[PDB]
Design a protein around this ligand. Structure first.
Ligand SMILES: [Ca+2]
Ligand SMILES: [Ca+2]
Lengths: 143, 485
């Protein structure tokens, strides 16, 4: 979508001390991450070698755009994830609580102890509110 | 309590054939799943019952609800229920036009034939009255009157073919005029013969209980997950099982976009009515309305069948949302609402609202880094600190699951004020985009609530004084630690 591209091209202007929209593979990871992705050092390499066989290491929009123009194929499931969050959030407060997690679980056959439950919440919880908001639910599901 | 119809009265308002709805009580109960339908043309009910074939997604012209052609899908959409609405008639006609060509051989059109019985069912419903006789070029016709003022109808004595013509002085919505001519209706092919179509049953939604979805997961893919030492990979792997076997939907050739449990539910439902006698084939022909994202309709009354086999009928949208809130998304059932809601559908520009819990929370939860960027993307329509887009990526760092809650709240209340600082001096620059200025005064508001929230969980402007923004490193974070004490 115009935005799909609008977003990538949007981040590009945040970290280039070049001005020609031609960043290095040094910041390629910096961008892919500030944009909601956590690539492994191995991946940042095997890719920047095939497509960018230029021999310079400078990546611009056409190059970066085309790269992202692959990843966002199966990962885009964000939709289902967001819908999933809503399944857990039985009271519609916008957060997933242990109690609620218990329900989704005990109903899907996995009887859990109030012990293990509060354990899962604290795992996924990131700012320690004792609950999981969508942003967190997202990390815990993507990250 | 909430004002909703029940039993008989509700079924009555639904439009479904009584026998059929009863057969549906069964499946609801068996599969323990809520079945929600969209309004069904009330003049279509007897046609459906008499076994007239219903219509698939390959046919988009609307049905009529007046005149001799009530219940059928008229080729000429100005005879449909969208009568008079020039723009709608046109999309209607273009739709039929396409149906006839883009599916040549599968969908066609034929003359309307009103049998002796339908004429009376129509006479009862007070839709048309069999009038006086008339002869033309040696043929016997009986007029058919209707309180319509643009058209005039007559039926043939020989083959019972109904015809129509514009009235003297009157003009079609498309500004036309013409004299006598058969009324054509959308038909489908069935064993080499063309058979008339009528409304079908459109599911508004389907809500199955989690348990019922479990039965959809392979007892091996699940055990494998359930049986994982690390919980962080346990949850995700469970949630992914929920997504895969209950949420995820995919496009099908003629059944449009639906999941697999939906396909089965579909089959079950059609089977149920076939068992009662319906000989027209399928009565449900595609996925649900929650997947109709381009052209989302919005009905005032939804007909519900709960796992108990009880008939309910909401009186209005707001009500429909309460019924789903209090008995479905709130009582352990799988539900997802149309992705177009709360947005401007692209197809018909519809803007249907729905209650989204994630948004009510938005106000107190700071944004992810992407949301920040993505909001600079779409914000960049009506129209250099990346520190903030990093800090926000820091606040939501998964490598936090190794600290105590206390630790978590601490470092986050910090990472927040951090970005709340950068946003601060950006607004301290030039008001570049007059309204970009709002997005930040806004974020700042969110950042504020989140922080002032994490603090009260343990012990804003106050503490936002005894902190550094000068030079840089693990020097500010220091004075901080103590402030909390
Ligand atoms: Ca909750
Ligand atoms: Ca949290």
């Amino acid at each position: 979508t115009e935005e799909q591209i609008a977003e990538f091209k949007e981040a590009f202007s945040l970290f280039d001390k070049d001005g020609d929209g031609t960043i290095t593979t040094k910041e390629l990871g910096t961008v892919m991450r500030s944009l909601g992705q956590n690539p492994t050092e191995a991946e940042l390499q095997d890719m920047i070698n095939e497509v960018d066989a230029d021999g310079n290491g400078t990546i611009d929009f056409p190059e970066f755009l085309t790269m992202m123009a692959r990843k966002m194929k199966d990962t885009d499931s964000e939709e289902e994830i967001r819908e999933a969050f809503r399944v857990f959030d039985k009271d519609g407060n916008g957060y997933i609580s242990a109690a609620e997690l218990r329900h989704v679980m005990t109903n899907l056959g996995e009887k859990l102890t109030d012990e293990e439950v509060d354990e899962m919440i604290r795992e996924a919880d990131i700012d320690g509110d004792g609950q999981v908001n969508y942003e967190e639910f997202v990390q815990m599901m993507t990250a | 309590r909430i004002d909703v119809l029940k039993g008989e009265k509700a079924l009555k308002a639904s439009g479904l054939v009584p026998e059929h709805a009863d057969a549906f009580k069964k499946i609801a109960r068996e599969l323990n799943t809520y079945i929600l339908f969209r309004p069904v043309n009330k003049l279509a009910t007897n046609l459906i019952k008499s076994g007239v074939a219903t219509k698939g997604l390959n046919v988009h012209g609307k049905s009529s609800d007046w005149g001799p052609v009530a219940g059928y899908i008229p080729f000429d959409q100005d005879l449909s229920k969208k009568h008079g609405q020039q723009l709608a008639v046109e999309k209607g006609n273009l739709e039929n036009k396409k149906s006839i060509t883009e599916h040549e051989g599968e969908i066609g059109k034929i003359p309307l034939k009103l049998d002796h019985l339908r004429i009376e069912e129509l006479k009862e419903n007070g839709i048309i009255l069999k009038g006086k006789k008339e002869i033309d070029n040696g043929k016997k016709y009986y007029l058919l009157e209707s309180n319509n003022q643009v058209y005039e109808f007559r039926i043939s004595d020989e083959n019972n073919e109904v015809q129509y013509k514009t009235k003297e002085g009157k003009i079609t919505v498309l500004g036309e005029k013409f004299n006598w001519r058969n009324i054509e209706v959308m038909a489908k092919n069935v064993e080499g013969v063309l058979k008339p179509l009528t409304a079908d049953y459109d599911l508004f939604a389907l809500a199955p209980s989690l348990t019922e979805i479990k039965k959809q997961i392979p007892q091996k893919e699940w055990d494998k997950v359930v049986n994982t030492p690390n919980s962080l990979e346990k949850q995700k792997g469970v949630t992914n099982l929920l997504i895969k076997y209950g949420i995820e939907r995919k496009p099908d050739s003629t059944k449009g976009t639906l999941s697999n449990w939906q396909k089965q539910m579909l089959d079950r439902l059609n089977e149920a009515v076939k068992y009662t006698g319906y000989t027209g084939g399928d009565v449900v022909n595609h996925g649900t309305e929650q997947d109709n994202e381009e052209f989302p309709e919005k009905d005032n009354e939804i007909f519900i069948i709960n796992p108990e086999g009880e008939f309910i009928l909401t009186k209005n949208w707001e009500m429909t949302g309460r019924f789903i809130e209090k008995n479905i998304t709130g009582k352990d059932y799988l539900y997802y609402f149309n992705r177009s809601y709360n947005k401007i559908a692209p197809g018909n520009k519809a803007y249907i609202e729905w209650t989204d819990p994630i948004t009510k929370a938005k106000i107190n939860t700071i944004p992810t880094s992407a949301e920040f960027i993505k909001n600079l993307s779409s914000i960049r329509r009506s129209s250099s600190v990346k520190k903030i887009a990093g800090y926000l990526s820091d606040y939501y760092n998964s490598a936090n699951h190794i600290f105590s809650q206390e630790k978590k709240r601490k470092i986050s209340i910090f990472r927040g004020i951090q970005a709340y600082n950068e946003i601060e001096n950006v607004l301290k620059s030039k008001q570049i985009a007059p309204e970009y200025k709002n997005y930040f005064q806004y974020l700042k508001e969110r950042i504020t609530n989140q922080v002032q929230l994490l603090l009260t969980h343990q012990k804003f402007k106050l503490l936002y004084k005894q902190l550094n923004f000068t030079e840089n490193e693990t020097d500010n974070f220091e004075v901080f630690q103590k402030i909390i004490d």
